[PDB]
């Protein structure tokens, strides 16, 4: 009833990109939605790291002092793309610092260390099940989870399930109020998303996001909570893939899809 009240040229955009774009956007005030390939599976890539940090925060509600726990790690933990954890190899970092690094710099070593804390990919999957997400699945660790093989459901979710879970965690009751705001604050401080959803969001609106980039099969993504001034927040997810292993991803296509989603919701932007 409230889905796709205004059609947008997502098909033309994905054809120009040479792949598939999946979009789900939710106006949390009216419940209106924009939906395009929203129930197809796309590889999570690093976008799982936001939900990873939420799962850690959930655990911290029952474990006072979890976030402050210092974690030492060896050089064998430092897999490629670990920009924060490599600078603290000789000192260690706290669980909260590892969570912030995973969210804000997509730190791979931090993500693997936190996955171990939660009981591995099945433990993160169990957390997502506990909030009502039956679509999300994490199956592997960094870096193997980025393979993005066409048709492979491992390490995927759907744009719709990503948006629904993000809403529950950032705006709903899935986390206690202090942990909810900490999750929002980590997302707001993300440094890797300036050319994706944020490029579609006016500078005077608050926004938090988590990006993902698999490095193959034109596969990259971003999800965000957006607070336009004077109205209810918007939650949205934009995922891409492409048929060939050497197909490149496009940040511009993600930003353009985000623009179309906001336009489809009637949210006046840039």
Ligand X SMILES: O=C(O)c1c(F)ccc2c1O[B-](O)(O)[C@@H]1C[C@H]21
**Residues annotated as catalytic (active site), given as ranges:** 46, 144
**Under the rule (CB under 6 A), what is the footprint of ligand RM9?**
45-46, 81, 106, 108, 192, 211-214
* Residue of the chain from 18, 69, 79, 83 that contacts ligand X (CB under 6 A): 83
Give the residue with the Cβ less far from ligand RM9, 211 or 250: 211
Give the residue with the Cβ less far from ligand RM9, 26 or 45: 45
Beta strands 42-43 and 33-36 are unpaired
Alpha-carbon span 53 to 183, nearest angstrom: 7
CB of 211 to ligand RM9, least distance (A): 3
Q: What are phi and psi of 185, to 5 degrees?
A: -65, -40
Q: Is 35 annotated as a binding residue?
A: no
Q: Which one of ligand RM9, ligand X, none is in contact with 267 (Cβ closer than 5 to 8 A by kind)?
A: none
Q: Is 244 annotated as a binding residue?
A: no
CB of 83 to ligand X, least distance (A): 3
Give the residue with the Cβ less far from ligand X, 135 or 192: 192
Q: Is 219 annotated as a binding residue?
A: no
- Note whether 84 binds ligand X by CB under 6 A: yes
Q: Which one of ligand X, ligand RM9, none is in contact with 162 (Cβ closer than 5 to 8 A by kind)?
A: none
List the interface residues with ligand X, window 86-105 (CB under 6 A).
Answer: 105
Closest CA to 257 of 238, 244, 242, 241: 238
List the interface residues with ligand X, window 96-155 (CB under 6 A).
Answer: 105
Residues annotated within the binding site for a beta-lactam are 46, 49, 81, 106, 108, 211, 213
Annotated binding site: 46, 49, 81, 106, 108, 211, 213
- Sites of contact with ligand X (CB under 6 A): 83-84, 105
């Amino acid at each position: 009833m409230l889905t796709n009240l205004v059609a947008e040229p997502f098909a033309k955009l994905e054809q120009d990109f040479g792949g598939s774009i999946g979009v789900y956007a939710m106006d949390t005030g009216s419940g209106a939605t924009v939906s395009y390939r929203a129930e197809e599976r796309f590889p999570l890539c690093s976008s799982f790291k936001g939900f990873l940090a939420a799962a850690v925060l959930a655990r911290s509600q029952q474990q006072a002092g979890l976030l402050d726990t210092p974690i030492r790690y060896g050089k064998n933990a430092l897999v490629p793309w670990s920009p924060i954890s490599e600078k603290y190899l000789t000192t260690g970092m706290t669980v909260a610092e590892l969570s912030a690094a995973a969210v804000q710099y997509s730190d791979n070593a931090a993500a693997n260390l936190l996955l171990k804390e939660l009981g591995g990919p099945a433990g993160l999957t169990a957390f997502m099940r506990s909030i009502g997400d039956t679509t999300f699945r994490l199956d592997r660790w960094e870096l193997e989870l980025n393979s993005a093989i066409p048709g492979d459901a491992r390490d995927t979710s759907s744009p719709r399930a990503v948006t629904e879970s993000l809403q529950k965690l950032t705006l709903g009751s899935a986390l206690a109020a202090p942990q909810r705001q900490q999750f929002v604050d980590w997302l707001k401080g993300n440094t890797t998303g300036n050319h994706r959803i944020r490029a579609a969001v006016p500078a005077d609106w608050a926004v938090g996001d988590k990006t993902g980039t698999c490095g193959v099969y034109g596969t990259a993504n971003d999800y965000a909570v957006v607070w336009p001034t004077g109205r209810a927040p918007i939650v949205l997810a934009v995922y891409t893939r492409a048929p060939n292993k050497d197909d490149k991803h496009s940040e511009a296509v993600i930003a353009a899809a985000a623009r179309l989603a906001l336009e489809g919701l009637g949210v006046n932007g840039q």
